[PDB]
Design a protein around this nucleic acid. Sequence first.
RNA 1: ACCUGGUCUUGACAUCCACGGAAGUUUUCAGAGAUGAGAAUGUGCCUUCGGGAACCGUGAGACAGGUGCUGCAUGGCUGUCGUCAGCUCGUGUUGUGAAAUGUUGGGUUAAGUCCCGCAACGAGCGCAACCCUUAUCCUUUGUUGCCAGCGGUCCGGCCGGGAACUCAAAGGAGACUGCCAGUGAUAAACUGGAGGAAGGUGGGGAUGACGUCAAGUCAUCAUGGCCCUUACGACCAGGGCUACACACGUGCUACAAUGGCGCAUACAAAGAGAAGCGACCUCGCGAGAGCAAGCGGACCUCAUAAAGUGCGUCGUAGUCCGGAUUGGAGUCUGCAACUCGACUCCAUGAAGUCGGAAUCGCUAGUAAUCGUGGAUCAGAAUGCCACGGUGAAUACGUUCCCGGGCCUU
Lengths: 153, 84, 129, 206, 100, 99
Amino acid sequence: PRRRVIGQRKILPDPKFGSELLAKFVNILMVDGKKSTAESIVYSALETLAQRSGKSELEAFEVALENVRPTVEVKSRRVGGSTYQVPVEVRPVRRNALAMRWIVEAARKRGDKSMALRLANELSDAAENKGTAVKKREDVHRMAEANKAFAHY
Amino acid sequence: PRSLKKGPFIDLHLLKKVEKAVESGDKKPLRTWSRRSTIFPNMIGLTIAVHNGRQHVPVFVTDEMVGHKLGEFAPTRTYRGHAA
Amino acid sequence: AENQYYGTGRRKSSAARVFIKPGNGKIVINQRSLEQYFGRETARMVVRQPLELVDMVEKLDLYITVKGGGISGQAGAIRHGITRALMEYDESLRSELRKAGFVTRDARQVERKKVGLRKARRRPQFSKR
Amino acid sequence: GQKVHPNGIRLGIVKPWNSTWFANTKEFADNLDSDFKVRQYLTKELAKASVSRIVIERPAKSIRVTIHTARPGIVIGKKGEDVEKLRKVVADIAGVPAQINIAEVRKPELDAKLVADSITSQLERRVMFRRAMKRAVQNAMRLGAKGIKVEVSGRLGGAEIARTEWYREGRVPLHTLRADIDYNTSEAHTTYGVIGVKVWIFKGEI
Amino acid sequence: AKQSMKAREVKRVALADKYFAKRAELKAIISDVNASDEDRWNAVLKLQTLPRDSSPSRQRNRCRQTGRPHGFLRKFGLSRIKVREAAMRGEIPGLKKASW
Amino acid sequence: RIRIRLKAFDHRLIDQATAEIVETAKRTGAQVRGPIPLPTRKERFTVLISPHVNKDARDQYEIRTHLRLVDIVEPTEKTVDALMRLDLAAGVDVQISLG
RNA sequence: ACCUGGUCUUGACAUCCACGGAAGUUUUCAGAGAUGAGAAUGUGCCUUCGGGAACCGUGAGACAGGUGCUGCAUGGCUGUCGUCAGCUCGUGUUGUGAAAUGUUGGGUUAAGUCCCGCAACGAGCGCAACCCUUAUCCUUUGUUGCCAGCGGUCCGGCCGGGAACUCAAAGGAGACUGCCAGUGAUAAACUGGAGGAAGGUGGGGAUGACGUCAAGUCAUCAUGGCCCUUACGACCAGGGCUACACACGUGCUACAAUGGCGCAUACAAAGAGAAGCGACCUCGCGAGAGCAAGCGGACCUCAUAAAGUGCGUCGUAGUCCGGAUUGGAGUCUGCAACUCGACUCCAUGAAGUCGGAAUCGCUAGUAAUCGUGGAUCAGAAUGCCACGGUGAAUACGUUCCCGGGCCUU
Ligand SMILES: [K+]
Ligand SMILES: [K+]
Ligand SMILES: [K+]
Ligand SMILES: [K+]
Ligand SMILES: [K+]
Ligand SMILES: [K+]
Ligand SMILES: [K+]
Ligand SMILES: [K+]
Ligand SMILES: [K+]
Ligand SMILES: [K+]
Ligand SMILES: [Mg+2]
Ligand SMILES: [Mg+2]
Ligand SMILES: [Mg+2]
Ligand SMILES: [Mg+2]
Ligand SMILES: [Mg+2]
Ligand SMILES: [Mg+2]
Ligand SMILES: [Mg+2]
Ligand SMILES: [Mg+2]
Ligand SMILES: [Mg+2]
Ligand SMILES: [Mg+2]
Ligand SMILES: [Mg+2]
Ligand SMILES: [Mg+2]
Ligand SMILES: [Mg+2]
Ligand SMILES: [Mg+2]
Ligand SMILES: [Mg+2]
Ligand SMILES: [Mg+2]
Ligand SMILES: [Mg+2]
Ligand SMILES: [Mg+2]
C-alpha cells in the first residue's frame, strides 16, 4: 500500500509437528476454509513421503523445499521508454511462499487418484529434481539469467 | 392440480347451461367465458365457444377432452414467428 | 493450591467457565472427556497450550462448561478461561502468559452485513455499460 | 447532497417524541391512524391559533392531547368553550375519552414551526421573500438564539426558474448530535406554485 | 392512489366482513373428511355463488394515508415513504434511526 | 404470589415505574423479589428512502421494547388494593397475573 | 394503471337541497357478471311524541373524478462527484478594476489536524468530539434465565435449595500519546517500550460541507399551468403485464474424489408468532392429513443448523458427476392453479469435462465456503435485509492504469 502500515500476522504451528512452515503449507493448500480437510491431506501425503524415503516428514519436506525454492525472479520495471524485466533477488519468506505455491499447483495439476497421493508424488519428484514446480523454478531462473544484463534498473 | 378430495371444479352457470342443453336437442354453440371449468363426461357432442380474451372460439367436445379445462383449447396469444 | 479457582473465557460467540484445582491432569468439558468433546487436534492443542507453557499440565484437574459458537471458538474461549484461572491460582505467571499472548481477549467478531453489499465487504459485480 | 432530518437524528438524544404511548402490533397501526386524523383536524381547525406542536398520549383507554400554542386565549375561547368543543371532536375521532391540555410557547420567534408558518403566510400575502427571511433571522437573533438558518425554495417572486435561497446567523452545528436544534418546514401555495420553507434554530448544546 | 381504487378496498373489506361466517362453514363442510359426496358438491357450488369480493384474498394492503399498494408495512399501516416522514417528525413512538 | 409485567419503549420510564411499584409494595408490608430485567426486544425495519428507484439508498430503524418483571410473594390485603390505583405514567404497559 | 367485450352518467369516492322511506336480515329468477325484476321478514332510537338523525333509494345542479401532459413551471424526497477535505464570510489592508489576502509558507496529521511564521485579525459550514454497537472489569437485580458448594434423585437443574458462575439489563470504571526513552525548531509531532481486555481515530455503524449533473421522481403525496367531462371519469367478466428468430446486465447450480452416496455422531447466532406459530400421537414412501397441548412468549412453537468427524462404498467414467427437460400420479393455499403457483413421488437423465477477446470483488474474522432467520405475503425467492460456523493468501513498493487533494506554470 501507499502508507506502509502493514504489520505481520502470527500463525499457529501445525498440530502433529509444531512447525509454522508446515502450518503455512496447510494454509496454502486449504480451500474454502476447510482447514481440517487440508490438514488430513497434508498429513497423509507426508506419511507417504516419510515411508517412501528414509528421513522424517520434516526433513523430506525441507529437501523438497530446498529443491523448489527460487533465488532470483523477474519483475517489470517501467522507465522513460519501455518496460524491462529486471531480475531481483527473492527474500527468504517469498522463497518459501513461492516454493509451496508451486508445489501445491503442480500437485493439483497432476492426475492421480487422491490429492494426498498427488501431493506425495509431487513432493518425491521435487526431492529428486523432477516434474513440475521444478521445471517452474528452472524457467524462472532461465528468465532471470536471460535478463541479467538489466540488473541495475 | 386441484385436490382430489375436493373434486373437479366447474362453474355453476356453465353446469346449468350444459344441463339445459343435454336434455334438449339444442346444437347451438354454448358461449362461455369460463375457461377454468373442467370438462365433465356429460357434454361430449356439443360445441362450446370458450372466450380467449377477445372472441369465443368453438371447441367440439370429444371423449378425449375429459379432465382438461376449457381454456386449454382456446389459445390466448397470437404468434406467427419473427420475420416470417 | 487448596480451593477452587475460577476463570471466564470468551471467543467469538463462545463463553467458557473454567474451574481449576490441584489434581493429576484429568480434563472434563461439558461432562465429557477432552478427546470426546474436541475431535480436532488444533482444538486440543489450543486447550492444552497454557498448561504446556506453564509446565503444570499434570498438577491440575479441569472442570469446564462451554456454550455458544463452534469448535474453534469454544477452544479459544476455554484457553482464555484457563489462562485466567491460572492467573488467579498464581499471580507470577501473568508475565509469561502475556508474553505467550494468552491473556489477550481476541475481540475479532463477525462483521455485520451492510446495505448494498452482498456481505460485510463483498460488493455486487460492477459493469461500466 | 441530501441531509439527515435534524429532529429524527436527535429523537433519542436531546429531542423528545411527539407521541408517547405503548401498543402491540395489534393496535399500533390503528393508534397511528387515529393520531394522524386527530392532528389533521386540530391543525385545520386551529389555523390562526399559532399551533407549534401537538403531543398525543394514551395512558389507559383514553387520549390526552397537549397543544403547544402562542395564542392560548384564542385556543381556549371564553370560559373554555372552544377547548371543550375541540375535546368533544377529538373524543369523537379517537373513540375514547379525550383530555386537552394547553402549553404556552413564550417567544414564538424562537419556535421553528411558527417562524416557518409566519414566513409562509407572508409569502402567500405576496410579501418580498428576502424581507421575510431577513426579518425572521433578525427577530430570532435579537431574542437570543445561538443561531438560525432560513431556506426558501421555489419560484421566488414568480420567477420562471425556481431557485433556493438561504440566510444564516450565529452557529447552526448540524453535525453535533447534542446540539439543541429546532427544525421545521412549511409550504406556501402561491399563484405560481408551491414554495418550501425550512427553518433551523440553535439554542445551545446540552 | 385513485379515489375509486380506495373505494374498491373499502367495499372489499365490508363484503368480507359481511360474508365471513357464511364462507367459513361452507369451507369447513368442503374440507370435512367424513362428509358425504353430494353435500360437498352442493357446498362447492354454493361457495361460487357468493360475490368474489367477499374473499379475504381479494384485499390488497394499502397505505392508510396515500393508498399506495406497494412498499406496505403492517406494523405501521403505511407505505415506506409515509413511515419515514412520520418517524422523522417523531410521530411513531419508540422508533428511531438504528445502528449496530 | 402475583406477577407484574412492565413493557415500555423507554427504559428510563420503565425504571421509574418499577421503582414506584417496588416502593408502594414494600411500604404496604408485602415483600418483593426483583425487579428483573427481561431481555430487550429489538424490532428492526429497513425502508427505501427515495420515492423512485435508487435501491441501495435505505434507512434502517428500530424499536426497543424493554421488559421488567416484579414478584410479589405473600401479598397482603392492603398490598393488593394499593396497586391498580397507582395510575402509572403513560407509555408503560402493565400486565397483572395471579401466580 | 393495458386490451376485447358487456354497461352507468351529479356518478365508484365528498358537501349542499327536495321527496320517499329505520337501517338491516332470508330467499327466487335472468345474466357471465356488472345489474335488473322480484318475493318475505323487521321498522327500531331522542321525540315538548311539531320533529328528527343514522342509514338507504330517487330527483335536479353547483360539482365530484383523471396512475391524463409538462420533473425543462414546482415543493418534498433521492442518486452523484464523495465521507473527498474542502467551501466561505465580517472588518482591516492591496489593486483603476475583475479580484487578492486571510485559506499562502516550514514542518506535521486521516483531516483547512495542530504548531511555528506571517497584513492580517476574527468567525461560520465542513474535520474531530458528543450518538449506537462490539472487546475488559465493578455494583444492583435474579425469573421463564444459571448450577460452584450441599442434600436427594426415576440421572432428566429433575426436586429441596444456592446468588457463586454463564447470562439478562440498568447504573458506573476504563484509552487520554496518560507514562518512559530517543528524534525533532526548547514546538507540533513521529519512532519504539512499559502497564492493560483494548494503543494511538481499538473494530463496525450512524453522521454526507458550499455546490454539480435543467440528474431521478407530476405514477407515493402535494402543487402552477394545460387538457377530458353520457368520457382520458365509473362498474364487470375474460385476456395481457409470464409472448420469443435474437442481444445485454445481475444471479443460482454445476462440470466432480479437498467429491457423490449410505449409516452414525457433535458445536451457533439472530428473529417471528393470534383469521398466528402450531407440539405430542396416529395415518401416508413423501409433499401432507386427522385429532389436539402450549404460547401474545428468557417458559410454548417455528426448529433437526450445515459445513464438520467416524465407518463403508464409488475408482476417473459424461460416471453412483451434473439435474435441465418431459410423461404419469399427487398435496396445499385459494371462489378459481389452462393461459400462469409452490411442493411431493415414480420414471426420464440435456448441456456441461473449468470457459476467446475482455472483465469484477476483496487488505482479516475480510475473501472463500456452510447453513439459519425476517419483511412483502392466502399461496408464491436462486432477489433483498439480517445472523452465526469454518476460515485463508498477499501487500517489495508508487514507475504505470483510474479517480481525487494541495502548490506552481
Ligand atoms: K425536484
Ligand atoms: K495590477
Ligand atoms: K475581505
Ligand atoms: K401538475
Ligand atoms: K391475467
Ligand atoms: K438468481
Ligand atoms: K451470469
Ligand atoms: K448420473
Ligand atoms: K397458475
Ligand atoms: K495545473
Ligand atoms: Mg458469514
Ligand atoms: Mg448499475
Ligand atoms: Mg388523488
Ligand atoms: Mg394479495
Ligand atoms: Mg430535474
Ligand atoms: Mg481553498
Ligand atoms: Mg483565495
Ligand atoms: Mg477546522
Ligand atoms: Mg496562516
Ligand atoms: Mg464527524
Ligand atoms: Mg431532465
Ligand atoms: Mg424521465
Ligand atoms: Mg379484472
Ligand atoms: Mg414485468
Ligand atoms: Mg447424482
Ligand atoms: Mg480498504
Ligand atoms: Mg410468504
Ligand atoms: Mg490537504
